[PDB]
Symmetry: D3
Subunit: 282 residues, 6 copies
């Protein structure tokens, strides 16, 4: 009863003072979109951050929808190898599913509870200018971010709108490219000198094995990739968080999307429920 | 030859003065979107409107792109008789082709010439609130406009952005509805009391016994649907035109979208090249 | 653990949205200044309301300090009866203790935790214009509020300062008058169309005997004074709350000052911990 | 023809974009001030410049009206030698025709076609601070420019007014000095860092053996005054042009004041109708 | 003496408070324009009015300089009858002395003592729109005032400039009309709803049999023109005074242009040195 | 007599111009607060400064009022030798007489004449942060200024309020300290880099062999404390004056507070009536 209330609020409220007016870039990866209750709490968390004066910016990935469409549209995966190739027709379907399907569902859910969210993509006012990714050879319209023009995002958050961004970039050649969501969300936070970058994943956070490491610095994060503690798909995430932070972002939080109110618990408590990467005061 | 340059300018410059800062809602139909040459001159015209200080707003349709998706997807039409029926799955493909492909091609083009266009749709910040169009029975997720919330538009145009709108509204329930681009375009123009509403068709304008009618008062226009001179799809148009004019829109122009620079010739010349409907005045 | 956090925050946060930017007038009566821990929590509550965007305004009464000074200064209570008389020399000592002693201690405590509080009184920019109270005959410089000039309060809260007001008013004759704190705090909230008026007392709130009545309307409050449920010193308080509310104040909360974080618990929970008086929506 | 309208506009509209808000200083010479149809066109071009968002500033000359005023006043054009002379009696008359007669003739016309013109001279607010001319002994009160105070001009054009300026300078001793309009116009231009200075002469411009010279640069222009292409009174002008260009002015234009609508053709077409002097930088 | 300073200031400083930011229109008549020491004082008072925060506007007359210009130009003051006449030739000369000579003499002086003066006439921005005078047959181009457009004046005084206005009116036909300075000054006053109109005459003001009249009201003043106290040319002036007062002007002042520092003494002392006409309202 | 009125105004008006919008920190001592007649003329002067557009700030002392409270309270002095000692209880009575009585009498007076005064003290929003003055040993809660936080002052004067400051600062610990009004007044003036710092004393100014010294540069002033010409309490003053001037204060004036209208005579006359210390200049 009562005391739980006092202590939660005394722990929380301060954070309302510090984050009021700041920008949080939140990456909707896989997980937090699977189980229904986790999906509901998430939508709710965003609305709360908005009630407290925070400017949330959402970034989402692809998923089931894309593989399905490709099949239902009788199209097979093409490879050069380092991976799958993305030919014109495939890019058109990806952009169609991401923008016309996933992006707008999130916008509907949010606008169903007061979020005033408007969906857009890298093409809009050239938010994300991209270029051909060539490390594995010409494998299609796979891109790397060349520049971020955040004016549109400032115009939106400045008028109380929550951007919902689909990872599709525009190249000078006018063509469109697919972009890794984590990277796009990180590049978008760097260009805004955003307070936080929140990456939702399928785990509690970085585990120094059997245990969750609550805090880390960019240097301590890399060291764990070098000494082999960090492996799998978790490597590219942490590597993304390290870059974001060294690029001007206040802090990056890696947390479990399958955890109900993971976002609410990570931001309004002092201990959190995931891993936070950040430079020391110094 | 000098003589020409002088005459065209003495006649255009005055319009640049009176239209500065004004808003023009333009409905982009099928013809001007079909021939690369009318389409190239169209983008060119929006850009010139922007350079003269006019605030354009674009609302586009769909057509071929949608049907093709239907066929490539094995989705079979359904009747609940009165006509076609936008069902659950049909809507999703419509929303996906309008938002994810058509909308973004227009945004790309404009942004390839300094238009600073951002493409949204009826769902974003609930710009277009719709409810199931019940007159022709239960034909599915076909809707009529309950209300237009123009805030996002104002935010975008005041910040020098060109909104490219997809005709898909949202219902209080939360389901997306397909709306007639002409009505949509006419409704938002009313909501903003725009200076002009421009409808690009495939015909020169409103014809009577093979003769283009230059001018029309709303009344004269009702007596042409009444008189039987206006028929077929042109009825819904003239209908929107009259509604728009009485609702506060300065004037609506029904011109031939297949005519190169139709917009330029209609706006910056005294006689015009199509039909303009407006009240009497001094 | 956890869930307590989620439910407290989900119950609280909404209120941050509604009260942000609003003004709360808080009356520091007797009680909440007695036991030390209650005094500490109170100071803390004010700072929190400030962290959340609320504009608190404090009003305090007299107490032990005044009786003491009168004795230490060898002065005896004079009566005409309806009460104690307030002769020039007595008024001078009251104003000295209230302004020079009580008022500034509160300011120090607050400014010890970030409150940016500045103490002032009814004399300042003629905040409280008063006049001779004559219902019991000329008994000295006892006053009734004749007018409130809240400009000074707007200048302060508008610049992030928390006013701490001592109940001393100025009369046109230039002389100063003592004013009942509850009345002054109520008159000050009315003149500001303040969202809330919070009266701290020595009880849980209005008790329909053995039980605490959580909510009431101005009419239901008076009825309880007529039917004799409300008696004692609690009559003038409720009567004060009724007036304030009928004068334009969002709502008045009567709560226990001896209760730790009474303010925090009353404003960030839906049930509260005292009595709230307010007109119905209608 | 519809192709003339398209072409003329596709050329002009872009200049409209880049000249919007800029300032043009224009020297109203003797030529265009003569033939009723050359004069009509000029007053019109000035207005159209205003309609497109440009801020025009006009500097006029004298000559005829003055000479006739000397002689009518029983005074014969006095000399001493180096040219004429402007003794105290001759000056006062000069200032009377330039400011009292001519300057008002120009304002009276513009203001019959919505010009919002207000005439002033170098004395008003000490716009043009001049010093007794020395390079030619003591030729009366003829003077040179020592300082320009555009404050008044700025104030005027920011309020949608068109400054019609008379070449009379004011000296530190309150005294008046006659000044060369072209050089006054060129000095005020530099003083504003205007976008353009237009000098209207009695001939197409700089003729390279009959053949007219379209564009040049400061360094080139001086070379034609050296080899002897620029002869006669076309030398004085070409220099101001240079002076101003190096003084910060965007570009200078020497056109046929006689050529009806010379201004219009020179500014909104890419080839102009006269000689343009400017620096190199695409 | 120290008591003189105290008294003079305790009187003046209050007027400084209430005249701060207000507008005063002042008619520079023939009197104060004559004796080098009367003239010196005037230019000084105007500056001091500016130093205290008042916005002065000056309207000058002509007379002498003109008459000498008629005759020097071989033209004798023509008549027909009802008084003089101002045929086309006579007007142009008039406009030349009022605007070209006189108006600049006043600006040249103020601007030697930090006045920031800029001279203009009724033509500039169509300040004074006049109609051919009719009450006296056809006496040339003498005219009456039909409309004032203070826009220019406002623009000027808001930028810390002092308008020096010449009485020449501009008619709907672009033509020029001579106008009575006093009435021009009174019309512009009403047009601005100025705080004061100062008419400088050739005598202390309105003399009630030698004895000077301090204050009056509109209704009273007219009565002295009826019984015959106000005789001679002191009738025309007194009327403008009335006209303006009823026209909205705060008050009017008729003082001795001859009296050195008349303005200063009349405005900062409670008794004034001349006759003041105004409405009743403490 | 006219002759006087003119001379006083030609000499005062110029000062009204240069002091408009400037800030004057005035230290109100014992003399001007002792005689009802100097005190009446003092309030009158602050009001006139306000009416001329100057932003006065008042810092007052104490003296008699405090001692009397001491005696009427049976509080006995204490020495920790070097001099008197402000102990726990002594401070509380000092704070109570300065804040609760003296401060409020000045606020009342001013507000009785339109001064819109609000009285604060060093504690309010930590305007004056002090630490125990350790030079003369441990004499109690006597303090020296560690820092001045002028925000509240800026808020008050920008909103047309006259701050009446009590010389009681606050220490980081939280204990209140007694500070020298002269230093306090000199410190805040430095913090605001006020135009003037005015010290009202009981002597005409800085004297040398019975002669008042009109002007002084900081250097000339140090050589008078050094030379032995300045003695006693005047040392701390001249000391503050020099410090203030070098710290950014435009000039400090040391005048006789017992002289009626000392402030008026010093500010609005060229010669002044006391001593003005300022750097050399042009
Ligand atoms: C991997 C990454 O950057 N993004 C995810 C987002 C979708 C998800 O988590 O399922 C992706 O697959 O592209
Ligand atoms: C029908 C109508 O109102 N609009 C068209 C626009 C598409 C086009 O021109 O191809 C539509 O299909 O919705
Ligand atoms: C009664 C009331 O209005 N105020 C209280 C405030 C002090 C307190 O509660 O002790 C008072 O005694 O004047
Ligand atoms: C002052 C001056 O040089 N004036 C020139 C203006 C006309 C011109 O150059 O064509 C003049 O004829 O008197
Ligand atoms: C135009 C006009 O009436 N002028 C007057 C101005 C001087 C005056 O009235 O003293 C004139 O003498 O010509
Ligand atoms: C001493 C000094 O600096 N100030 C005086 C001011 C009081 C007065 O003039 O009576 C003081 O006692 O603190
Ligand atoms: N995993 C962690 N270390 N979490 C700490 C979170 C701290 C705080 N709520 C923030 O948002 O910064
Ligand atoms: N169809 C017409 N008759 N059009 C007339 C066009 C008038 C003007 N150019 C305009 O855009 O308003
Ligand atoms: N006693 C009560 N009824 N309390 C309800 C409080 C509700 C809410 N927290 C408010 O501040 O309005
Ligand atoms: N003579 C010329 N070079 N004319 C070209 C001028 C082109 C265009 N009017 C401009 O101001 O830039
Ligand atoms: N003749 C007079 N009545 N003069 C009184 C003028 C007083 C003061 N100068 C004012 O403008 O109000
Ligand atoms: N003591 C002096 N000599 N004072 C000169 C005063 C100068 C001017 N009046 C001022 O206030 O700055
Ligand atoms: K633009
Ligand atoms: K004021």
């Amino acid at each position: 009863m009562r005391i739980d209330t006092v202590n939660v609020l005394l722990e929380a409220l301060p954070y309302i003072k510090e984050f009021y007016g700041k920008t949080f870039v939140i990456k909707f990866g896989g997980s937090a979109m699977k189980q229904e209750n986790a999906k509901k709490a998430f939508i709710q968390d965003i609305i709360l951050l908005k009630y407290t004066g925070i400017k949330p910016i959402i970034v989402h990935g692809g998923g089931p929808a894309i593989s399905q469409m490709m099949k239902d549209l009788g199209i097979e995966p093409v490879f050069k190898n380092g991976h799958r190739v993305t030919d014109e027709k495939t890019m058109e379907i990806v952009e169609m599913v991401l923008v016309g399907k996933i992006n707008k569902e999130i916008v509907m859910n949010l606008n169903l509870h007061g979020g005033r969210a408007v969906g857009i993509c890298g093409k809009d006012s050239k938010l994300i200018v991209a270029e051909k990714e060539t490390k594995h050879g010409d494998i299609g319209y796979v891109g790397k971010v060349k520049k971020v023009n955040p004016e549109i995002l400032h115009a939106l958050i400045e008028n109380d709108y929550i951007p919902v961004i689909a990872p599709v970039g525009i190249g000078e050649d006018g063509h469109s490219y697919n972009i890794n969501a984590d990277t796009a969300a990180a590049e978008i936070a760097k260009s805004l000198m955003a307070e936080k970058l929140i990456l939702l994943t399928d785990v509690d956070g970085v585990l120094k094995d059997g245990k969750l490491i609550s805090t880390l610095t960019p240097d301590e994060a890399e060291e764990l990739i070098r000494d082999g503690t960090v492996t799998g798909g978790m490597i590219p995430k942490v590597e993304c968080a390290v870059s974001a932070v060294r690029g001007g972002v206040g802090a990056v939080h890696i947390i479990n999307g399958g955890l109900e109110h993971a976002i609410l618990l990570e931001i309004f408590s002092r201990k959190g429920i995931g891993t936070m990467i950040k430079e020391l005061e110094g």
